[PDB]
Design a protein around this ligand. Structure first.
Ligand SMILES: CCCCCCCCCCCCCCCC(=O)O
Ligand SMILES: CCCCCCCCCCCC(=O)O
Ligand SMILES: CCCCCCCCCCCC(=O)O
Ligand SMILES: CCCCCCCCCCCC(=O)O
Ligand SMILES: CCCCCCCC(=O)O
Ligand SMILES: CCCCCCCC(=O)O
Ligand SMILES: CCCCCC(=O)O
Ligand SMILES: CCCCCC(=O)O
Ligand SMILES: [Ca+2]
Ligand SMILES: [Ca+2]
Lengths: 382, 382
């Protein structure tokens, strides 16, 4: 007797930390102080959860971790993957939200931004398996995680994405996947691995956890040899146009799943055809909104501060249909693209823009009730 | 050599730290990143300076410090005033920007916010002295600062005020000045008086400097005895309606000085006649805007975030004329009131609102050059 038959799992994006893993003073990811998504939907009789997965890691690593967060158990990235990229095979161990998750017992998945790519990858592994792992365990025996087997169906009812960079973002390509910024991010991760740190930024599999008796000097020296510094097995790569197109090229539609996208615009056309961020765009996205909005290709300009619209609407090589706000969003197997939220930047989707008074709590509450209602109607039309 | 014959001294208000007295990471007071007032005006040929005076102290302690900042020497707050409020007589010693300042060598005074009040009190001391010190020195001998003796004129060419609370602000009466908030400010002052601190928040004359060999516990006990905790000789008091009316009542017009005010509004009328902050009001003033905006007296409602329009246009019941932006602002002895700058909040005057992209550097630049233009007019017409 929750009102939804299937548990709802909200999956954060690229930078986010949740629950026990957030620093001392740090915004609440799912709703900021505008609408406490988890707490308020629960007060309403819904069974909902926020996943906690790697903040800086690849979609791959995140999809595996999402699997273990739902099922419970010790993260297994796969032998073949671990050896090819140069990081640990085994990771955190999760309590598990639905230990009985299996064909027939389903979950709804909602992902903000990179969360939406993560969800699509995890589901691809459940349905189709991972060819490199099946081959290797056949070549080398031992174990293979049931995440990599293939043949798992009827496990996810829905995949809904909010401001997801399905075709990547120039803010990754031109900033950020660049070498200087990857170093900044990896240095942060090294520092947050220190022996006084209680928080996990998601790259401990590459060596970034200082041992209780290791000096910080020996720590620096050891971790400067990790392959993280030059690998593509990280978020910044995956959020690039190439990195996201690679994910599109190996995913496909499950005809049994309900697909739906939401997209925000927070830029406006300037006298030359370029896009500039609206007053109101959370200010940390000002430069990235300009870089996107000055693209040479006109259709790659309109953006939500960090993801252009042509990237959020749907993966470019996958089937989609434009839907009105009033249509039940209840077609299976095709991306149902919601009308664009005017004025919503990338973080207004999760209510942490505490400086934008145009975007209020009661608006954000209607937006999330609206998604639960669509999910209730997936349940009813099955 | 300089294009202005008389030096310009800019004087910061209540919370302001400038120059080498600002923390490692901290906005530049005079112009933010939008228009670097001191540096650009020097490039363009003007002789200008940024005074450095107590950030938390009374207009009285600040006016004394302004005089020594200009003239040079060791700050003497006056024996009668030290004995009456229970703080040290002698404070910091300044090098002096114009060691030769005396009748005949004038200076232009430009005050932001509380700086406007500080500057009127200083002029008042030059012309009329300070009667309690004159009386004290008469009765007890000793020495008396020449700041307190009176009869020093032709030292100030102009007084210009930006968003100065000439008539006080309800943001002081109702918050900040309240007990709970003075404790906060005094605790910050105690903290930054610690023996590792290189920044002076302007209350060390009340005992807030930890000795090199004094423990933190001892420092706490010693200073918990200071009168600062219950005194009115501080900024929060002086910014209230009563504390600014006390200063109005002891000041008078000087018929040789050119007086000019600017004022901003950043609030808009609600359907009940109340004022709420516009979007773009620097966010830290949203609450103080609402407090001012919801006053019982309608003419006290319009505001710049923290100062009501009525407090900023001119001291009440001192003579004033409304002036245009075009006409010469060259009248003597009379507050010239500049038209209210629409959309400018209290901190847009000094360009530190890095969140508000409506207020451009080119605009802030034009605004300060227009002040300098006026000051050149003052010089040309004397
Ligand atoms: C100048 C005073 C500022 C206070 C204005 C009331 C604003 C309410 C907002 C509450 C949260 C902000 C302060 C908490 C500090 C923090 O979270 O780091
Ligand atoms: C927001 C604070 C930024 C401080 C900059 C220091 C950067 C140095 C790289 C540090 C690497 C490490 O400590 O492991
Ligand atoms: C944003 C930092 C505020 C932290 C709260 C500490 C308040 C304690 C009062 C401190 C007094 C002192 O340190 O002398
Ligand atoms: C950065 C804070 C400065 C404190 C230095 C003063 C040292 C004296 C210690 C008194 C004992 C205590 O600190 O609790
Ligand atoms: C001293 C605390 C530092 C925490 C860094 C958080 C970065 C992130 O949000 O992913
Ligand atoms: C630990 C850093 C303290 C900064 C004090 C800032 C107060 C002020 O602006 O007057
Ligand atoms: C540093 C604060 C991060 C908030 C989460 C996000 O921006 O997606
Ligand atoms: C801390 C707020 C004090 C408000 C008075 C003013 O700045 O004009
Ligand atoms: Ca916004
Ligand atoms: Ca502003």
């Amino acid at each position: 007797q929750p009102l939804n038959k299937y548990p709802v799992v909200f999956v954060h994006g690229f930078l986010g930390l949740v629950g026990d893993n957030a620093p001392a003073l740090y915004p609440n990811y799912w709703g900021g102080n505008k609408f406490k998504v988890i707490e308020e939907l629960r007060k309403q009789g819904y069974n909902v959860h926020q996943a906690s997965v790697s903040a800086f890691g690849s979609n791959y690593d995140r999809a595996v971790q999402l699997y273990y967060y739902i099922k419970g158990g010790r993260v297994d990235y796969g032998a073949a993957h671990a050896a090819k990229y140069g990081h640990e095979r085994y990771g955190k161990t999760y309590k598990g939200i639905m230990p009985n998750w299996e064909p027939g017992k389903k979950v709804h998945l909602v992902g903000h931004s990179m969360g939406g790519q993560t969800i699509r990858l995890m589901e691809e592994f459940l349905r189709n398996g991972n060819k490199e792992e099946i081959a290797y365990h056949q070549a080398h025996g031992g174990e293979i995680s049931p995440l990599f087997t293939g043949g798992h169906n009827n496990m996810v009812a829905s995949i809904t994405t909010l401001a997801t960079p399905h075709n990547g973002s120039q803010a990754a390509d031109k900033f950020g996947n660049t070498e200087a910024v990857r170093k900044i991010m990896f240095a942060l991760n090294r520092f947050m691995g220190n022996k006084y740190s209680n928080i996990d930024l998601g790259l401990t599999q590459w060596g970034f956890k200082q041992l209780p008796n290791e000096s910080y000097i020996d720590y620096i020296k050891r971790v400067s040899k990790s392959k993280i510094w030059t690998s593509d097995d990280n978020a910044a790569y995956d959020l690039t146009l190439d990195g996201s197109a690679k994910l599109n090229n190996m995913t496909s539609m499950n005809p049994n799943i309900t697909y739906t996208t939401y997209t925000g615009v927070s830029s406006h056309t300037g006298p030359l055809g370029y896009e500039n961020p609206d007053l109101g765009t959370f200010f940390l996205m000002d430069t990235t909104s300009r870089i996107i909005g000055h693209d040479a290709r006109e259709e790659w300009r309109k953006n939500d501060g960090v993801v252009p619209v042509i990237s959020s609407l749907h993966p470019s090589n996958q089937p989609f249909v434009n839907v009105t706000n009033n249509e039940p969003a209840t077609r299976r197997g095709i991306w149902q693209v919601k009308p664009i939220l005017q004025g919503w930047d990338h973080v207004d989707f999760i209510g942490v823009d505490f400086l934008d008074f145009k975007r209020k709590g009661s608006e954000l509450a209607n937006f999330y009730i609206g998604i639960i209602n669509d999910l209730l109607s997936v349940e009813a039309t099955e």
